[PDB]
Design a protein around this nucleic acid. Structure first.
Lengths: 50, 48
RNA sequence: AUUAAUAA
RNA sequence: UAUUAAU
């Protein structure tokens, strides 16, 4: 009933290590197929790239 | 003992909020290339 | 008062 | 310490 996407903010400034670690965390925190999903397809693509 | 350093870091915080607010209110108008803080004095090198 | 730059 | 530049 609720799915997530990625927020883009030009004012945000962060270490790239945060994004690379979130890449690992997202695969262990979310479900993306089978019977239901918590993510959009673009969000899964971004997590895969991370 | 730490007057100048604290003054300059407070000025840095003010400049950070300045940049964030001008980016929010008028996107794509000003790009910031340099920021300098030496106390109560602030300098910016930007492109308009 | 506080940091520097020369002189001693 | 002496002078000066700055804060």
């Amino acid at each position: 009933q609720i799915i997530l996407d990625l927020k883009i903010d030009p004012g945000e400034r962060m270490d790239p290590a945060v994004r690379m670690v979130a890449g690992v965390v997202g695969h262990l925190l979310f479900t993306a197929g089978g019977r239901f999903t918590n993510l959009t397809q673009n969000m899964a693509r971004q997590l895969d790239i991370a | 003992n730490s007057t100048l350093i604290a003054n300059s870091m407070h000025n840095m915080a003010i400049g950070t909020l300045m940049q964030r607010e001008v980016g929010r209110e008028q996107p794509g108008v000003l790009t910031f290339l340099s920021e300098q803080y030496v106390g109560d004095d602030t300098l910016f090198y930007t492109k308009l």
